[PDB]
Amino acid sequence: SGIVPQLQNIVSTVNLGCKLDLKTIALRARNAEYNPKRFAAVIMRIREPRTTALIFSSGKMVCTGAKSEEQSRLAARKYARVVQKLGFPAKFLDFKIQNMVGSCDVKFPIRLEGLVLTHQQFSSYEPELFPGLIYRMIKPRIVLLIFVSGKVVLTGAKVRAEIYEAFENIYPILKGFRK
DNA sequence: GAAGGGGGGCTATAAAAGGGGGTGGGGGCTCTCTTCCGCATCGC
């Protein structure tokens, strides 16, 4: 195909293995914001990795915004150290990547009306609700947002192989509905 | 001050986290016959 999707966002969850005091973290953490009325977690941001992480009292933390697997793990470790630097016994346990978001362009307009007809079992095109066709691939459990402009967004992948594999499967299908 | 324009939020997509709140599902017309009541009567 000659086109490789580029990851736009990765969601990874890591357990620190120790209960944390959310109020204490907000007071001392540099960028943390805690609003129990709004959300029950502590939202923190670190610019150099350019990622955002949510910290819960149970010790589990979710890291989002990383553009690569290495960045997500590095960003998650940095957040854990910040909590550890606050006097808590934070660790890096069962780090896992929960979601990978990738985007790409096929460089040609797509006839979404034709695509849904031939793939009604997997496609879902509702212009009233969303201007982009939602494709649910089965062999890889990846949900693809195909747009008339040609932009394709892949999400729900656990590994980078699924993102590339999913695009390889849909690209020939899109080529058959080129506008 | 009406109208077009610009910027931005909303919509859906996945996923994790944890808890509050929303939602749904149990539980403390005429004639005839029968029955009841008041009365006067005797009885003891």
> Which residues sit close to strand B, CB under 7 Å?
A 9, 11, 13, 39-41, 54, 56-58, 60, 62, 64, 98-99, 101, 124, 129-130, 132, 134, 141, 143, 145, 153, 155-156
Backbone phi, psi, residue A10, to 5°: -130, 135
What residue numbers of A does the annotated binding site for DNA cover? 9, 45, 60, 99, 136
Whole-number distance in Å between A41 CA and B19 C1': 10
Q: Which among A14, A26, A20 is positioned nearest to A87, based on CA atoms?
A: A20
Query: Amino acid identity of A153?
Result: V
> Which residues does residue A136 pair with via DSSP β-bridges, in sequence order?
A143
Q: What are phi and psi of A88, to 5 degrees?
A: -95, 155
Helices (H), A14-156: 22-28, 69-85, 112-118
Give the Cα separation of A135 and A72 in Å (integer). Answer: 27
A113: region left, alpha or beta (phi > 0 left; psi from -120 to 50 alpha): alpha
Reported structure resolution in angstroms: 2.5
**Among A39, A91, A97, residue whose Cα is nearest residue A72:** A97
- The distance (Å) linking the CA of A127 with the C1' of B3 is 29
What number of other Cβ atoms are within 10 A of residue A41's Cβ? Answer: 20
Cα–Cα distance measured from residue A169 to residue A146, given in angstroms and rounded to the nearest whole number: 13
Q: Which nucleotide is nearest to A158 (CA to C1')?
A: B15
Method of determination?
Answer: cryo-EM
